[PDB]
């Protein structure tokens with residue numbers, strides 16, 4: 001119920017798996033939401049436009065007492081087949097949603113919000129040992145995929161991500177002028193974004209079965225996340241302490257299973273659980289430790305917000321933050337759909 005928590009649920013309208021969990025995550029990323037509302041969806045086709053459809057879900061989630069439907073959204077980005085959600089990752093859906101958004105906001109006041117919130121920068125060095133030659137290339141990322149297989153916690157995942165790899169023997173490095181050389185290869189972070197989407201590599205390939213198997217191994221993540229030790233140059237004025245916002249959770253061993261999201265919407269630490277139409281209050285511990293694993297129920301994705309940007313990221317939202325031309329068009333659609341049923 002809405003009156004229980006302040007928040008409404010999402011309708012269950014097919015095997016959308018992680019979609020409802022993510023939508024709620026994206027919705028409670030308040031700064032994104034404000035920016036979605038401002039998109040010039042004036043001319044757009046009521047069915048073929050993804051940005052409108054996202055504006056609709058968010059509107060409804062903010063205003064409706066009753067659970068909110070996603071069918072126009074799934075039609076809008078074209079994931080209407082049985083195996084659509086089943087064969088993709090959660091981050092690939094997030095990219096489909098955020099790219100559509102980010103492109104609509106080009107030539108707009110709200111330009112660049114998506115990258116402002118989610119784009120970090122990393123380096124991918126390759127260093128030869130014997131003769132000197134180096135390759136430093138910056139890459140951008142909107143999300144990170146942490147390995148968990150035999151890592152106790154997030155600390156050990158970040159250690160693994162940046163750990164120096166080696167290149168010798170058969171699979172050596174082509175240093176161009178210098179021939180196929182012996183060399184080290186790694187990654188380091190230059191910046192970590194305001195909103196840190198982390199995915200846990202739980203659905204790993206098994207060469208015996210010719211299928212991905214879910215790994216239910218125990219994997220710990222904290223409430224508070226000091227990531228300063230994983231940057232190339234720190235900032236004393238803006239250190240990289242991150243707060244846990246959302247724990248996207250799965251139960252069972254496959255796409256059928258059971259997808260829930262636990263969120264801390266305001267960043268206070270008064271958490272709620274979102275199981276489609278049911279939104280219940282819950283403990284810090286039903287959200288954090290109980291999804292460590294060790295049991296088929298465990299976290300696959302985590303959202304951390306940086307303490308320095310928490311208030312900005314979680315800036316309050318009012319009914320006055322949706323433009324009235326859009327508010328009108330949405331209520332107009334609610335009324336047209338009322339005349340058919």
Ligand SMILES: C[C@H](Cc1ccccc1)C(=O)N1CCC(O)(Cn2cnc3ccccc3c2=O)CC1
Pocket residue numbers: 017018085086087088089090091145199200201202203204214215250253254255300301
């Ligand atoms: C259908 C599938 C079922 C599932 C498997 C495992 C855990 C939860 C639910 C599902 O719902 N998934 C959405 C979430 C993921 O995307 C997360 N995840 C995992 N492994 C990776 C390996 C390598 C690289 C990136 C990931 C990753 O993102 C798995 C698929």
